[PDB]
Write a protein that binds this DNA or RNA. Structure first.
Ligand code: K
Ligand code: K
Ligand code: K
Ligand code: K
Length: 683
RNA sequence: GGUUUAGAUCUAAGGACUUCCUAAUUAGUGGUUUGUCCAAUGUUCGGGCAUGCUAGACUCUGAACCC
C-alpha cells in the first residue's frame, strides 16, 4: 500500500527534449527525502546517520550529473518516435508497445543510476524486475514497498554504509531505514517521473482494466485534439470565466474516445494559481460536504421515487434496472403467453440503441422530465432520506465482519444548476486549459447525469409508446437504458413501433436511433432464430438465455491441498473484483449484484471440480473454509463501500453474497454447520 | 563412512546512545567520560518468507542431510 499507479495516469503535457532533465530537485533536497521522508532538516537526525550523509550525497549527485548530460532527445527519436502517418484502425494501436516503454524506462534508468546506486549487479536485476512490475500495475493497482525490497540485499549498499560491512544491530536498523527511503525515492521521484515525462497513460475503457496504455505525448496530443475539435463543434461552447466544473478526460474506444468529464473540486482560479495551500484546502473540503449532505440526498430522493414510478406507472414499467431483469421479464412473458395458447405463436423482435445518449440529452426536455415526477406533489415540501457515511465512519467496532432531509423546492434548483452550469476544461494548443459549456446533453461523469438519462427515457417511453400497452399480453419492451428491445406476436404492432423509431418524433427528447445497429428477427422458420441482446442470447422461438459464458475466464485450477487452493482464488478474486465494477455511479445497484455473483460463481464451481481430485489425498477441514468465506465476503463489501464512499445498499449486497454461496455448496452433504454460519452475518 | 551447520561462553576488533573540543555550507570531519547497548527488524492464518547476522577458541551443549 505504498507505491500507487494513479499518480502517473492522465498526465498530459507537450514536451521539449532538447534541454530536459527528469530530476527537478537538488542533492540536498533529495537527501532529506531519503533520510527523513516525514520531515525535512535532516540535521535533526542522530549523529550516526550524518556519518553516512557523504555517501548518500555522493551517489545522488552522480545520477543528477548523468541526468543533466542525459541526451533525452536522442533517446526519444531512437526508440519511441518512429511514428508514421498511417491512420491506424483503433486508438489503442497508437499506444507505445509495452515491451518498448519498459525498454525506454530501463535504459534511461540504466544510464541514470551507476551500479553503486543499484547496489551491485545482482541487485540491479532485482530492482529492474520491480520497475517492470510497476509498469504492469493497473490503474488502481498499488504496490507494497516491502515487496519491492524483498530480494534486495542491503549489505551490498556500501555507499549507504560508512564504507565497511554492517557492524552492529543499530547499524542495521538505520541502514534499512535509509534503504527504504532511497528505494521509495527511486520509484516515486524517478520511475514515475520517467513514464510521466514520455507517456500519457490512460485506462483503456474496454475490459481488463488492469491494462494501461502508454501514448506518446506527441501522438496523444494529435489524437485528442483531432477528436476534441469534432466533438467541440456539436457539443461545446467557448464560455467566459467549483461544484459545476470538471476536467475533460477522453478514454480510448474502438477507434473512438468516450468523453468523460471528472468533476473538479478547486474553484475557477484556485486551479490555475495552485501555489496556495490555504485556499485549496478550504475548497476541497467544501466539495466533500457538498456531496454527502446536498448532492447525495437529491440523488437518493430521485431514485427512491422512480422505484415507485417504475412499479405503479405502466409507462416506467418498460424501464429496467439491471441486465438480468431483462432475461426474467422475457422469460415471464414467455410463460405468460403459454397460459391459453400453450403453443407459442410466431414472434417478431427488434433491437435498437441511442447514439451518445448522455451527449444528446435534450436539456429542455430534461427539466420538464424532472418536473414531471414532482408535478403531482406540492412545491414547498421536504423529502427525507437516511445517512450512510463512509467505511471509516464505522468505528463502533473495528474490523467489520438516522435521517436527513432536503426540500424538493431546492432539489429542483440543484438539478437545473447541474444541467446549465456544467462546464469542462479542455487543454488548448498553448497548454493552458479553456472553459467549455455544453450545447446539448450532459457530461458523462457528473453524479446527477447518471439518473438524468434514466428518468428522461422512462418519461420518454411513457409519453411515446402508449400504443404498445393496449393488450400488453401481446407485446412488451424493456429499456436497459442505452439499448432497446421489443417482442411482439403480430405484425400489426411491430409496424407501428418501427415507424416511430425511424421518425424524428423520438429525437425531440434528444435520442437519436442508431440504425446501424438495429437488428430485426422473426421466427418464420428460415429468417433467423439466434439473436444477441445486451448480455442475452435470446432465441426467437424458445426464449432460452445463456449470457456470455466468456466475460470472465477460467481460473485454470491446478493447485494442491490444503490452503494453496484458497490462496490462488483469493488473490484472483479481488483482481476480478475491480473497483470500476463496484462503481455505484457508473453502474446500477442491481447490476453490481449480477457481476459480483459472476466473479463469485466462477471461483466456487472451480472448487468443486478439483475438490474430488485431492479429496483422496487430503480431507478438507470444515473450519478453514469458513475463514476463507469470511475474508472473501468481507473484502467484497469493504471494497464496494470504500470505492463509492457511501454505504448505499451494503446490507443489500450482503444478503446476495451469502445467498449465492449457500446454493454453491449443495455438494458435500451435511455442510450444515458452515451454511448456518452464513446466516448470522450482519455486522 | 561422507557433507553441512547452530546456540551458549571466553578473548580480540569494530559499531550504537549520552556531555565537552572540530578555520567543515552542493559541508557533516577528528579525538573522546562518570552509566548504558551490539542482535534482530519487518512480514504472514508459535512455524514460513525477505533483509541482516566481525573474528578466533581442544571452553560447553548440540543439530540436519546422504551413504
Ligand atoms: K558502521
Ligand atoms: K560450528
Ligand atoms: K557456530
Ligand atoms: K556462535
Amino acid at each position: 500500500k505504498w507505491i500507487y499507479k494513479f499518480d502517473v495516469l492522465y498526465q498530459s503535457r507537450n514536451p521539449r527534449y532538447r534541454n530536459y532533465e527528469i530530476i527537478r530537485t537538488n542533492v540536498q533536497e533529495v537527501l532529506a527525502e531519503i533520510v527523513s521522508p516525514s520531515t525535512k532538516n535532516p540535521n535533526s537526525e542522530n549523529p550516526a546517520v550524518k556519518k553516512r550523509f557523504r555517501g548518500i550525497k555522493n551517489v545522488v549527485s552522480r545520477i543528477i550529473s548523468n541526468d543533466k548530460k542525459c541526451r533525452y532527445d536522442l533517446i526519444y527519436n531512437k526508440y519511441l518516435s518512429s511514428s508514421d502517418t498511417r491512420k491506424l484502425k483503433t486508438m489503442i494501436d497508437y499506444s507505445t508497445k509495452f515491451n518498448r516503454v519498459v525498454e525506454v524506462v530501463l535504459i534511461i534508468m540504466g544510464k541514470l543510476l551507476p551500479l553503486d546506486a543499484w547496489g551491485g549487479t545482482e541487485n540491479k536485476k532485482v530492482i529492474q524486475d520491480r520497475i517492470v512490475d510497476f509498469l504492469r500495475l493497473g490503474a488502481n493497482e498499488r504496490l507494497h514497498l516491502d515487496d519491492v525490497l524483498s530480494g534486495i540485499k542491503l549489505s551490498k549498499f556500501k555507499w549507504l554504509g560508512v564504507g565497511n560491512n554492517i557492524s552492529s544491530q543499530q547499524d542495521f536498523q538505520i541502514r534499512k531505514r535509509l534503504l527504504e527511503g532511497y528505494i521509495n525515492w527511486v520509484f516515486i521521484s524517478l520511475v514515475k517521473n520517467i513514464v510521466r515525462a514520455f507517456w500519457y497513460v490512460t485506462e483503456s475503457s474496454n475490459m481488463d482494466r488492469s491494462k494501461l496504455f502508454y501514448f506518446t505525448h506527441s501522438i496523444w496530443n494529435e489524437l485528442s485534439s483531432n477528436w476534441i475539435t469534432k466533438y467541440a463543434k456539436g457539443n461545446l461552447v467557448q464560455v467566459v470565466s467549483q461544484f459545476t466544473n470538471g476536467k475533460i478526460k477522453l478514454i480510448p474506444k474502438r477507434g473512438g474516445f468516450r468523453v468523460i468529464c471528472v468533476p473538479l473540486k478547486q474553484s475557477l482560479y484556485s486551479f490555475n494559481n495552485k501555489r496556495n495551500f490555504a485556499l485549496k484546502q478550504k475548497e476541497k473540503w467544501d466539495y466533500i460536504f457538498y456531496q454527502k449532505y446536498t448532492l447525495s440526498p437529491v440523488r437518493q430522493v430521485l431514485q427512491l421515487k422512480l422505484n415507485a414510478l417504475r412499479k405503479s406507472d405502466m409507462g416506467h414499467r418498460s424501464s429496467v434496472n439491471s441486465t438480468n431483469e431483462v432475461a426474467d421479464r422475457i422469460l415471464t412473458f414467455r410463460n405468460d403467453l403459454l397460459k391459453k395458447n400453450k403453443t407459442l405463436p410466431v414472434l417478431y423482435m427488434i433491437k435498437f440503441d441511442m447514439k451518445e445518449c448522455y451527449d444528446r440529452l435534450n436539456q429542455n426536455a430534461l427539466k420538464e422530465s424532472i418536473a414531471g415526477i414532482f408535478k403531482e406533489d406540492n412545491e414547498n415540501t421536504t423529502y427525507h432520506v437516511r445517512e450512510y457515511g463512509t467505511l471509516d465512519e464505522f468505528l463502533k467496532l473495528k474490523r467489520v465482519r438516522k435521517t436527513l432531509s432536503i426540500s424538493k423546492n431546492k432539489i429542483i434548483e440543484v438539478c437545473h444548476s447541474q444541467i446549465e452550469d456544467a462546464t469542462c476544461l479542455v487543454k488548448n494548443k498553448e497548454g493552458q486549459y479553456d472553459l467549455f459549456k455544453r450545447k446539448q446533453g450532459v457530461f458523462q461523469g457528473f453524479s446527477l447525469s447518471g439518473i438524468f438519462c434514466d428518468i428522461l427515457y422512462s418519461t420518454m417511453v411513457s409519453k411515446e409508446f402508449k400504443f404498445l400497452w393496449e393488450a400488453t399480453e401481446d407485446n412488451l419492451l424493456l429499456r436497459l437504458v442505452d439499448d432497446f428491445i421489443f417482442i411482439t406476436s403480430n405484425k400489426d404492432t411491430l409496424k407501428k413501433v418501427k415507424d416511430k423509431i425511424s421518425s424524428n418524433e423520438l429525437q425531440k427528447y434528444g435520442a437519436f436511433v442508431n440504425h446501424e445497429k438495429t437488428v430485426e428477427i422473426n421466427g418464420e422458420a428460415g429468417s433467423s432464430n439466434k439473436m444477441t441482446f445486451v448480455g442475452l442470447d435470446i432465441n426467437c422461438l424458445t426464449l432460452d438465455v445463456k449470457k456470455d459464458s466468456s466475460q470472465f475466464s477460467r481460473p485454470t485450477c491446478k493447485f494442491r491441498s490444503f490452503k494453496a487452493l484458497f490462496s490462488n482464488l483469493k488473490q484472483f478474486y479481488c483482481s476480478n473484483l475491480s473497483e470500476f465494477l463496484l462503481d455505484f455511479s457508473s453502474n446500477s445497484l442491481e447490476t453490481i449484484r449480477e457481476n459480483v455473483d459472476a466473479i463469485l460463481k466462477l471461483t466456487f464451481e472451480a472448487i468443486q471440480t478439483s475438490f474430488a481430485t485431492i479429496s483422496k489425498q487430503d480431507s478438507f477441514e470444515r473450519y478453514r473454509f469458513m475463514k476463507f468465506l469470511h475474508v472473501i465476503i468481507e473484502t467484497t463489501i469493504e471494497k464496494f463501500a470504500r470505492v463509492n464512499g457511501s454505504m448505499e445498499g451494503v446490507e443489500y449486497l450482503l444478503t446476495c453474497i451469502k445467498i449465492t454461496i449457500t446454493k454453491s455448496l449443495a455438494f458435500m452433504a451435511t455442510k450444515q454447520e458452515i451454511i448456518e454460519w452464513l446466516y448470522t452475518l450482519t455486522i
